[PDB]
Paper text:
NMR studies in the 1970s demonstrated that aromatic side chains can undergo ring flips—that is, 180° rotations of the χ2 dihedral angle (Cβ–Cγ axis)—even when engaged in stabilizing interactions in the hydrophobic core. Our data therefore suggest that the conformation of the aromatic ring at position 526 is determined by steric interactions dictated by the size of the surrounding amino acids.
Of note, three mutants (H493A, [name] and A541L) induce a staggered conformation of Y526, with χ2 dihedral angles ranging from −41° to −75°, whereas V517L shows an eclipsed conformation of Y526 and an almost identical structure to the wild-type protein. In agreement with this, both variants show line broadening and chemical exchange contributions as detected by 15N and 1HN relaxation dispersion. In addition, the analysis yields exchange rates between the staggered (canonical β-strand) and the eclipsed (classic β-bulge) conformation of kEX = 2,830 ± 70 s−1 (H493A) and kEX = 6,800 ± 300 s−1 ([name]), compared to kEX = 2,600 ± 70 s−1 determined for the wild-type protein. Finally, the observable chemical shifts of the two variants, in conjunction with analysis of the relaxation dispersion data (Supplementary Discussion), show that the H493A mutation slightly stabilizes the minor state relatively to the major state, whereas the [name] mutation almost inverts the relative populations of the major and minor states.
Author numbering:
A (entry chain AAA): 491 to 548
B (entry chain BBB): -2 to 58, 61
Amino acid sequence: QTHRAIFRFVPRHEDELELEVDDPLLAELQAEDYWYEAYNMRTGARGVFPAYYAIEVT
Amino acid sequence: GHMEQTHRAIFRFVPRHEDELELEVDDPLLAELQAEDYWYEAYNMRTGARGVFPAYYAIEVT
């Protein structure tokens, strides 16, 4: 588990991942435009979300 | 008549989607929160562009 969601994110777009506060994530930063590609370890869903909605954990 | 600035961008936002508004840090905004999904409908007072962006990317101004 690499990251954690810090704010609620409700998708508007089909490619986006829904986040609740405190969701644990496996994620990779797409640094060309600062979106994460991620797997939500609470829901099992996949998709993208804007980078400042998550912190790195280690 | 005047409209006061409502919000200020705090993080860089680079659109992936046609309806989105590009933000640079400290950009001045006129914006209205959409409560069903916590996106703003906004006008960027620096760039003159319009579109949507996610709520955590801006603060309220006074």
